[PDB]
């Protein structure tokens, strides 16, 4: 049990405070460093585990020992001494560049920083499969863990007298969060008259009871067993976008269709939600073209009318009708059109802001309703 | 011809449906796989072509054979058996990490996956130049296609018994899109009194008749022959941004000048369009200094008043008057100022939304129009 | 929660729903990067290059060593009551 003294320090953040005290539990004592220094001198192999009765095993890795044993030592009786030094000097200077890029000025805070095992690959000899084998890191979810960069290390001791770095590497454990479901959404376009429109919704959505929130898939791998994320991926969703996903459909934003857009039909419940005003829906059973009047924005294709349908040169057998016949413009409320471009947002936001300032005097007049 | 039976499938997208059926045409029958397996067993070189009359040639590439024939096999009369295995083991484990990073869990949908020839470079042995020549891929536009990642491969067959992956690689054919013009825009700053401003316009703009659209140069190479693009780069432009490009200068958003902005003079029609209120425009042929009065926002320099002009430290020889004398502030309409920062947009959008809610009881109760 | 009926009327459809799992760190193991190799079998053939290698390492290693010490000296045992 230790306290943070709190007086020799300046403005410090929760990450640096927690990591600073966590360094006390993970850092080896002065005796272990002396024992580690003595055992590292006698080490000859690129990867070697040092067994100590006091605590757990420590794995020692050397990033240029493989070149020396496999290439240089067998050539000692063949090459000259001048050439041997030249070849090793090339490998040492390339090694230093990777150490400089890893533990360098780009690493602003060496204490609060977590380095993934894959980012350590060159510092470890080039590969990490032999390192993970000797660390005991294996299982049915190693690939999913490794794909999310879940194996991370922290610097615990740097020895400038013997030139070695000690890190604390941990194999994560997977815990399921109750009440949270991660939904992946897909969409198709629809036509209002002759314009093809598209609904803007998040690609991933997470729900927890009555709460709908966004989801970040940067650190998440969607393995068949389940979704595994390194960092907690839930961040809040705007209340207006939450009413869209609850069925209002007037709070959802529509965007126009770009040049590269191959999402015009989706197979769902043995049916075909297809935009027949933007592609050609042909009924292979009868040869009749499935049309779509301007009063309809979407059509659902089932075997009750067209058992086999051809869309965009693709023939698909459909089944029982699980959907209505079509969606009508007069019986659906659609949202306002938007543009997702960075410059398009700025142009429209600036135009809207200017309009508000031109009527500032009218807006502040709250007594106009009272007067009338 | 085949039909997709939409019965054993869940929700499937058009890309998954189209790629699934396209796999039937691309995949080889069980006899060709049996013949391919026998030929691969007798292959000895890093790259070989398999000849058969049932189809076209199949190129066989193995990613480690170059090391074995060039490095390992020659050095076996002097190296021990144990050292030979260690040297090969290092290469086999780095090759695996390339295949894991390529065909592993990071590849969520192998059916609809198109892999560029560049991404396969290490899996092909390190270099793709010798692979491209044996595929017959050459011509004057190889560099433009190759730089746009136009050569892509699809996964066709995976054999776990003999450990090989069959891919379908295609050389694209370029077709010019009728009626589409891609414009590259440049701009200079202008001064309103003492403040230097700048017009926010897209760097690339597409034109098709009366319609103006945006352009995405991410996959596009502007080769001397022409513009070659992998995907379709046209996406819709906001109607307000289209009125700006069509003449309405009040619809163009303007932003303040950064600290690294050094675009203050442009050479156009043999003249110099310069912001002389922000740089020192000096007439070399006379020694006088060209000034920009605050009633003018931009200056056009021609040889009719100053044949040679020094701009910052560079002297250029301008030509006959191809532009007006200057642009006057009272004879031009400018748009609203904006900020393109993500935090600047959020702060200004929240302020605008909050003011809108403060007048909801008045904006919705728009009945004084008919009451007055 | 999500009203899937109205989402399908505007083209939006669900294509997958699973449970959410995060990562937690419980145990820790020690990994040591031995920066200085063993050159006993080389017989002084790399004397000059090793010294060059050591000098470059100190320039980048020394700031990290100072940062670690400055924080671990600010950690003191509990002296309650």
């Amino acid at each position, epitope marked *: 049990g230790v306290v943070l003294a709190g007086a020799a320090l300046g403005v410090a953040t929760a990450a640096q405070i927690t990591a600073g005290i966590a360094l006390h539990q993970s850092m080896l004592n002065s005796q272990a460093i002396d024992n580690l220094r003595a055992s590292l001198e006698t080490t000859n192999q690129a990867i070697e585990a040092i067994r100590q009765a006091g605590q757990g095993m420590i794995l020692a890795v050397q990033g240029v020992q493989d070149y020396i044993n496999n290439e240089l030592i067998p050539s000692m009786n063949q090459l000259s001494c001048d050439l041997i030094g030249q070849k090793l000097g090339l490998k040492l200077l390339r090694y230093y560049t990777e150490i400089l890029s890893l533990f360098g000025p780009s690493l602003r805070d060496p204490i609060s920083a977590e380095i993934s095992i894959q980012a350590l690959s060159y510092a470890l000899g080039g590969d990490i499969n032999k390192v993970l084998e000797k660390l005991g890191y294996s299982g049915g979810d190693l690939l999913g863990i490794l794909e999310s960069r879940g194996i991370k290390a922290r610097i615990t001791h740097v020895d400038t007298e013997s030139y070695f770095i000690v890190l604390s590497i941990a194999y994560p454990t997977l815990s399921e969060i109750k009440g949270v*479901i991660v939904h992946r959404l897909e969409g198709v376009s629809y036509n209002i008259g002759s314009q093809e429109w598209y609904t803007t919704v998040p690609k991933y959505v997470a729900t927890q009871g009555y709460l709908i929130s966004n989801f970040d898939e940067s650190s998440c791998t969607f393995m068949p067993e389940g979704t595994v994320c390194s960092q907690n991926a839930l961040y809040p969703m705007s209340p207006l976008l939450q009413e869209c996903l609850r069925g209002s459909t007037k709070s959802c934003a529509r965007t126009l269709v770009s040049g590269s857009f191959g999402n015009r039909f989706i197979l769902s419940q043995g049916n075909l939600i297809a935009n027949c005003a933007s592609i050609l829906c042909k009924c292979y059973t009868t040869g009749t073209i499935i049309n779509q009047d301007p009063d309809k924005i979407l059509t659902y294709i089932a075997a009750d009318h067209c058992p086999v349908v051809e869309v965009n040169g693709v023939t698909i057998q459909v089944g*029982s*009708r699980r*959907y209505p016949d079509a969606v009508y413009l007069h019986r659906i409320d659609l949202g306002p059109p938007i543009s997702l471009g960075r410059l398009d947002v700025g142009t429209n936001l600036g135009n809207a802001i200017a309009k508000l300032e031109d009527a500032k005097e009218l807006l502040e007049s709250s007594d106009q309703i009272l007067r009338s | 011809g085949v039909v997709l039976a939409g019965a054993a499938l869940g929700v499937a997208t058009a890309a998954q449906i189209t790629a699934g059926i396209a796999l039937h045409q691309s995949m080889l029958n069980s006899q060709a796989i049996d013949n391919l397996r026998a030929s691969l067993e007798t292959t000895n070189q890093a790259i070989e072509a398999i000849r058969q009359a049932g189809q076209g040639m199949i190129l066989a590439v193995q990613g480690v054979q170059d090391y074995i024939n060039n490095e390992l096999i020659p050095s076996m009369n002097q190296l021990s058996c144990d050292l030979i295995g260690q040297k090969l083991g290092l290469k086999l484990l780095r090759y695996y990490t390339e295949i894991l990073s390529l065909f592993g869990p990071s590849l969520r949908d192998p059916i609809s996956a198109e892999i560029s020839i560049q991404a396969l470079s290490y899996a092909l042995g390190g270099d793709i130049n010798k692979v491209l020549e044996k595929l017959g891929y050459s011509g004057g536009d190889l560099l433009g296609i190759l730089e746009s990642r136009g050569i892509k491969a699809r996964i066709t067959h995976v054999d776990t018994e003999s450990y090989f992956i069959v891919l379908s690689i295609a050389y694209p054919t370029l077709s010019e899109i009728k009626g589409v013009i891609v414009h590259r825009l440049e701009g200079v700053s202008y001064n309103i009194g003492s403040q230097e401003w700048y017009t926010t316009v897209p760097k690339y703009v597409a034109t098709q008749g009366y319609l103006i659209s945006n352009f995405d140069e991410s996959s596009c190479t502007f080769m001397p022959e022409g513009t070659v693009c992998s995907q379709n780069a046209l996406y819709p432009m906001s109607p307000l941004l289209q009125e700006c490009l069509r003449g309405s200068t009040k619809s163009c958003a303007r932003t303040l000048v950064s600290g690294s902005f050094g675009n203050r003079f442009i050479l156009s029609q043999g003249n110099l369009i310069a912001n002389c209120a922000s740089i020192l425009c000096k007439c070399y042929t006379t020694g006088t200094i060209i000034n920009q009065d605050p009633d003018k926002i931009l200056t056009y320099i021609a040889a009719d008043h100053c044949p040679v002009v020094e701009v910052n430290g560079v002297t250029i020889q301008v030509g006959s008057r191809r532009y007006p004398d200057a642009v006057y502030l009272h004879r031009i309409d400018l748009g609203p100022p904006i900020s393109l920062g993500r935090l600047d947009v959020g702060t200004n959008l929240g302020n605008a939304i909050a003011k809108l809610e403060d007048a909801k009881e008045l904006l919705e109760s728009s009945d004084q129009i008919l009451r007055s | 929660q999500i009203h899937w*009926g109205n989402l399908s009327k505007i083209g939006v459809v669900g294509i997958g729903s699973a449970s959410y799992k995060v990562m937690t760190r419980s145990s820790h193991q020690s990994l040591v990067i031995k920066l200085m190799p063993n050159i006993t079998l080389l017989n002084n053939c790399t004397r000059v290059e090793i010294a060059e290698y050591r000098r470059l390492l100190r320039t980048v290693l020394e700031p990290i060593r100072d940062a670690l010490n400055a924080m671990t000296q600010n950690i003191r045992p509990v002296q309650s009551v």
Partner: antibody
Amino acid sequence: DVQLQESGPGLVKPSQSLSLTCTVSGYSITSDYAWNWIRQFPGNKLEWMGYISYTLTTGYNPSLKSRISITRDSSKNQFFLQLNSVTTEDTATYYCARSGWLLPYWYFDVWGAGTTVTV
Amino acid sequence: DVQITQSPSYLAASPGETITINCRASKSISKYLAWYQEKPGKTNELLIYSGSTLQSGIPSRFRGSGSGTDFTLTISSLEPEDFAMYYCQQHNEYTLTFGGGTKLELK
């Protein structure tokens, strides 16, 4: 083709918990459709219990929703039925079926073999 | 909920004859009603859905009709395999209520 097969205890003590398991073959239950539970009383009476959708949406019979719960297992491709406070009236033949997930098209197109529960 | 009554409870007929089963709902359910066939030793089969739509693979002799509250199922040219239990189930709303049932006996 889609094959549904129930497997559970034939006899359960009163006021205990009932646990069934409908295993689905020839499809995946994490891909589309509503997976339902229907029970047939002695006397030719069918009664809908509830459903789990592939979007993990659940619904139950209003007169039985208090003591019922439906859950799914993606790894083994099966879904379960949990019934508590079992009385003598709960004895029936229990059926697992597949519907679509959207009204008014909630008709069942694949049924399980069927299993009987005695109280 | 909606109450559905299926009549007759038992029906005796002979092969080659035409029969008719009527189902009545307390409240209008549009055209949304499904018909099923129950046979011992085999799983149930959907015959008609959404009023009068014949499921693929079902013999054409099965006829559905009606809209709102009155619904009828017609089987013509009876075969020995058509003698089984039949149900009518409405799929419009919750709660999903089946029918009483109807059995066919040879005569």
